[PDB]
């Protein structure tokens, strides 16, 4: 029960999703061929959350991989753990989006979105108790921002009550990798703010720092970052798959992390993260794991929480731990950094403890934080969006695909309101 159906999009989604399924299979003892060879029996009890069963023990991930070009998917199946997926789930077009939201949303992805739903509905209908949909994409691209938001809107109109959680890679502030990011990001956020229950913002610049500072890695491939993103994705869905002292369902986090409907953007974090040489200089106990989770340098988003306040926070622990220490340490943070937590929420921390830790680790903890500091990210995008749009920087690539200039104004205005709403709630009572 509580089955989750995995949806991909764009080059970013398939790459992250591919590493997501490699990790999930590893902790469930699933071979790349699809067979089960695990040791513990608990990992097989709740395997229906992510996998479907077939004859001979083969387990088929409940994943839908989609993009407007076949190249990335061809890489996925060829690579390790690529044969695991069911072939029918690869819904791909021929002409890719040129990194323009209009093409992937109105023109190119429009003629392919119908096929994707035919696979989603067949997947969704096969669940005993559907919990929700998990989506991974990037807001700066064309397929992700355009088609990903198109898929979200269709699903939210077809499964209104289910939970839609999206792990979106957000453009970094320092340097970009697509010239038209402000157009794609602003248009995508105009859709997410209405049709997803929780979004986890991550930017590559933040994950580079985590590897450079913490992991002390000198050749960080995109695979390395995807592993970190996979770990946070894995952590938030541990209660559904393993026993624990205090469980936290996906809908349980949203209630504790989303005060108001439009403020559903979080910045995740993970711990512990130590270099191979620094493993022997740590106690690896509960007090220190909680210490770095709230550290600004151990968060997978560019925004620094010191610039704002935490509306809410969630800490999902893994491994056998003293519940007293978890309660004590969490309270300690609430006390010292009382200036960092909003004052009209008496308690901002939600604690969950899964019993089984990730492979090779005795302890783990995943941080989720809803902070007014995230308004910094949106304002930066708004500043770049208005600079380009003030003199029609690249519109003809978008207006020529079917969009209209009014849509850009609506997206900017809606983006501005969200920034204002975050700022309004950063002021204390009265």
């Amino acid at each position: 029960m509580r089955e989750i159906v995995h949806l991909q999009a764009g080059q970013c989604g398939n790459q992250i999703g591919a590493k997501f399924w490699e990790v999930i299979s590893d902790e469930h003892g699933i071979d790349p061929t699809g067979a089960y060879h695990g040791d513990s029996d608990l990992q097989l009890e709740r395997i229906n959350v992510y996998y479907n069963e077939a004859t001979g023990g083969k387990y088929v991930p409940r994943a839908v991989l989609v993009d407007l070009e076949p190249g990335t998917m061809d890489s996925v199946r060829s690579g390790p753990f690529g044969q695991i997926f069911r072939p029918d789930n690869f819904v791909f077009g021929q002409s890719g989006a040129g990194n323009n939201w209009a093409k992937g949303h109105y023109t190119e992805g429009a003629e392919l979105v119908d096929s994707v739903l035919d696979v989603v509905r067949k997947e969704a209908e096969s669940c005993d108790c559907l919990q929700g949909f998990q989506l991974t994409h990037s807001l700066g691209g064309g397929t992700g921002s355009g088609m990903g938001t198109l898929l979200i809107s269709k699903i939210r109109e077809e499964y209104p009550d289910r939970i839609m959680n999206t792990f979106s890679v957000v453009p970094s502030p320092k340097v970009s990798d697509t010239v038209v990011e402000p157009y794609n990001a602003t248009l995508s956020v105009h859709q997410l703010v209405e049709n997803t229950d929780e979004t986890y913002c991550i930017d590559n610049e933040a994950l580079y720092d985590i590897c450079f500072r913490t992991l002390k890695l000198t050749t960080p491939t995109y695979g390395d970052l995807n592993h970190l993103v996979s770990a946070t994705m894995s952590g938030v869905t541990t209660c559904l798959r393993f026993p624990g002292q205090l469980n936290a369902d996906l809908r349980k986090l949203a209630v504790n992390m989303v005060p108001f409907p439009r403020l559903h953007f979080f910045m995740p974090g993970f711990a512990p993260l130590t270099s191979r040489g620094s493993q022997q200089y740590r106690a690896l106990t509960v007090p220190e794991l909680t210490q770095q989770m709230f550290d600004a340098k151990n968060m997978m988003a560019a925004c620094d929480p010191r610039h704002g306040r935490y509306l809410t926070v969630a800490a999902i622990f893994r491994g056998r731990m003293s519940m007293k220490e978890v309660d004590e340490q969490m309270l300690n943070v609430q006390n010292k950094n009382s200036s960092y937590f909003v004052e009209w929420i008496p308690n901002n921390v939600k604690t969950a403890v899964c019993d089984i830790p990730p492979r090779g680790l005795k302890m783990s903890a995943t941080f989720i934080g809803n902070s007014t500091a995230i308004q910094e990210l949106f304002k930066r995008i708004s500043e770049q969006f208005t600079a380009m749009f003030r003199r029609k920087a690249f519109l003809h690539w978008y207006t020529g695909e079917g969009m209209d200039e009014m849509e850009f104004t609506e997206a900017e205005s809606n983006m501005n309101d969200l920034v204002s709403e975050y700022q309004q709630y950063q002021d204390a009572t009265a």
């Binding site: 080059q11 070009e69 076949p70 190249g71 990335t72 061809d74 890489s75 021929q94 002409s95 890719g96 989006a97 040129g98 990194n99 323009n100 970094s172 320092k174 340097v175 970009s176 990798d177 697509t178 010239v179 038209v180 990011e181 402000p182 590559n204 610049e205 580079y208 590897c211 450079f212 050749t219 960080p220 491939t221 995109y222 500043e383 770049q384 600079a387 380009m388 003030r390 003199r391 029609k392 920087a393 690249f394 003809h396 690539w397």
Partner: protein
Amino acid sequence: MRECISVHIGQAGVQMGNACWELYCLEHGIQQDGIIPDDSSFGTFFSETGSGKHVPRAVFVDLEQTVIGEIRTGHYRSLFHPEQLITGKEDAANNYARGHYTIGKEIVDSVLDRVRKMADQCSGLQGFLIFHSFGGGTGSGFTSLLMERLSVDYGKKSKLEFSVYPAPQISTAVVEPYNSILTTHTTLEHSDCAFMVDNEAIYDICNRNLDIERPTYTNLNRLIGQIVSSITASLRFDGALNVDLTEFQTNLVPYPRIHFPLVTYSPIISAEKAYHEQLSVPEITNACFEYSNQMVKCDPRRGKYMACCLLYRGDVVPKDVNAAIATIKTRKSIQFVDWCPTGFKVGINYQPPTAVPGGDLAKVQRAVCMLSNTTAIAEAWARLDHKFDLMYSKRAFVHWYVGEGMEEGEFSEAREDMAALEKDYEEVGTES
């Protein structure tokens, strides 16, 4: 699954194309024929046949038959399909009218047919690659004639072109201003992105960086071939952050009438002097923005950048790319336009560049090709327009063009259109 139709017009395109397909054949293990010895990503460029023969997806067209005849007798004689190599009766004699109106009217239909047969043999059409000279003749009339036909038959499909833009001082034809401007007027509305290269610039690179005092056109073509290999590398090979030919359009073209990026290829280093260079990512990235390494003799710092695409190859760590670009953003001399806060498009590929046997470039580990759109190129048009005005005031060579199907009115229209384009750059280059 992907595809590209390479169309090579005029002597410049055919000779440049020969370097390209010599390099493509090397990169895929092909054996100078359609055969592969006793290698799987060739589908983008090379068609396949049951005999094991791979047929290039290219069309070699020239109103002159001298250069194409050399191919039919060269080492690549058995590589191309014979009907692809299309040869006219007489050349255009460096006259735009002959290529566009009189001679081109008897060959444009034949080349279009072969494109049609190739177009419907593709699983999915991605775009075209057009190689032609800007000097004039077939490269100006026929190319403009062919481009307008494609704009109708294939419409919204991408049409990329690589052009041998006239050099500032060096010149080989007396009537380049007439032909260079005329082709621009009839190709602005039919081309998506035009990549510019000048022989003088590559001559400077070949002698300033490669320690060769005797550059031939073969040397320049191989340098140009490497650029094209990098642009199409994303399709041909796997990588961490791929970029497609439809992306260059929205990434480098901010306005429909301003689609003339420059070209740069950083690790142009001799074999001997490569032993004394670390060739790390940050240094090659910084080399792109120097005036000394532009493939078009136009100094970027005279103007403002408005869009840049970086295409990395080989053993490249994306973290260094992030660091390398950010520092370039910091420099106050490297000025970007106000209305483009997001300046860079980044693509990374795992295939290191292949060195052609007998070549001059070193066995580099990692390479970067930069496609930068800058207002500095507005100066090049101004210089070209200045030369055109001098001749036309005297009607220096008009009678040749008027008497071969063209009209006196078109000269005025073409120059006036260029004047607006020069003015268009000024508006883009000013904020508030």
